[PDB]
Amino acid sequence: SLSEQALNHEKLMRAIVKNLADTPMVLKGETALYLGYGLNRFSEDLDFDCHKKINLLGRVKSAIPNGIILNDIHIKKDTDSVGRYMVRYATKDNKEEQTLKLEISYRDAPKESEVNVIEGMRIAKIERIIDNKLCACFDGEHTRTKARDLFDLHFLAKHYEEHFNLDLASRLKDFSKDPDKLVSDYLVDVKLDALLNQIMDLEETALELGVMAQLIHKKLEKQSHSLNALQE
């Protein structure tokens, strides 16, 4: 769009992720879609998988780009299974303190062969992002109700349909079968979410996703039925 505040935020996020390209850290989730795959809404948090501990504090400080001032890094959590940091910073454009949230999950880690590199950044593959989005908003242990999940899944079905398999498509179809329910579930969150409220038509998105999920699932079935006949 994009505000000057957002621009400095993106610049700090990019420097950090690029700094970690020689570590086993893998960017996932929403900001992976934004920095790596062309997501058309902004994203502000950094989320990683990593199979072992690293010098996070050191890499972050050595990543700080010109124009950004690092005030403090607060370690909310550093355990065997999770890392959670609040990177507090200001800019030359503004001395008002901003926060970058950085989270890491350990032994979630993708195999090294499940990692992409995009513009010098280690990022999760699309199918893993899809799988994790569906878990979080539809069929995981602890689901949630955040309109971003709908926006992102719609973005994924629309622009990356070739990365869905039968299982992902089937779940996406299940999730999106009742477009009215989706509107009911998300309308409040959409209007309150400043990353969405000016760009998202919730009704259109809900309708369009339900139908795309049908198509994707249908194509994959026809592909399967066709493959079998050919195999004989």
Residue numbers in the entry: 11 to 242
Sentences from the study reporting this entry:
JHP933, a conserved putative protein of unknown function, is encoded by the gene in plasticity region of H. pylori strain J99. Our work demonstrates that JHP933 is a nucleotidyltransferase superfamily protein with a characteristic αβαβαβα topology. The molecular details regarding the function of JHP933 are unknown due to the lack of sequence similarity with other well-characterized proteins.
The final crystal structure of JHP933, containing residues 11–243, was refined at a resolution of 2.1 Å with a Rwork and Rfree of 20.43% and 23.08%, respectively. The N-terminal core domain covers residues 11–170 and contains 5 α-helices (α1–α5) and 7 β-strands (β1–β7). The N-terminal core domain of JHP933 has an αβαβαβα topology formed by α1-β1-α2-β2-α3-β5-α4, which is coincident with the common α/β-fold structure of nucleotidyltansferase (NTase) fold proteins. A Dali search for structural homology identified lincosamide antibiotic adenylyltransferase LinA as the closest related structure with a Z-score of 9.6. By comparison to the active site of LinA complex structure, a conservative large cleft is identified as a possible active site for substrate binding at the N-terminal core domain of JHP933. This substrate-binding cleft is surrounded mainly by β-strands β1, β2, β5 and α-helices α4, α2 with a size of around 13×20×20 Å. The corresponding residues are G39, D55hD57 and E113 in JHP933; with G39 at the connection of β1 and α2, D55 and D57 located on β2, and E113 is placed on β5 structurally adjacent to β2. Therefore, with reference to the structural conservation of these NTase superfamily proteins, the conserved G39 should play a crucial role in binding of substrates, and D55/D57 and E113 likely are involved in the coordination of divalent ions such as Mg2+, which chelates the phosphates of a nucleoside triphosphate substrate and plays a crucial role in activation of the second substrate's hydroxyl group.
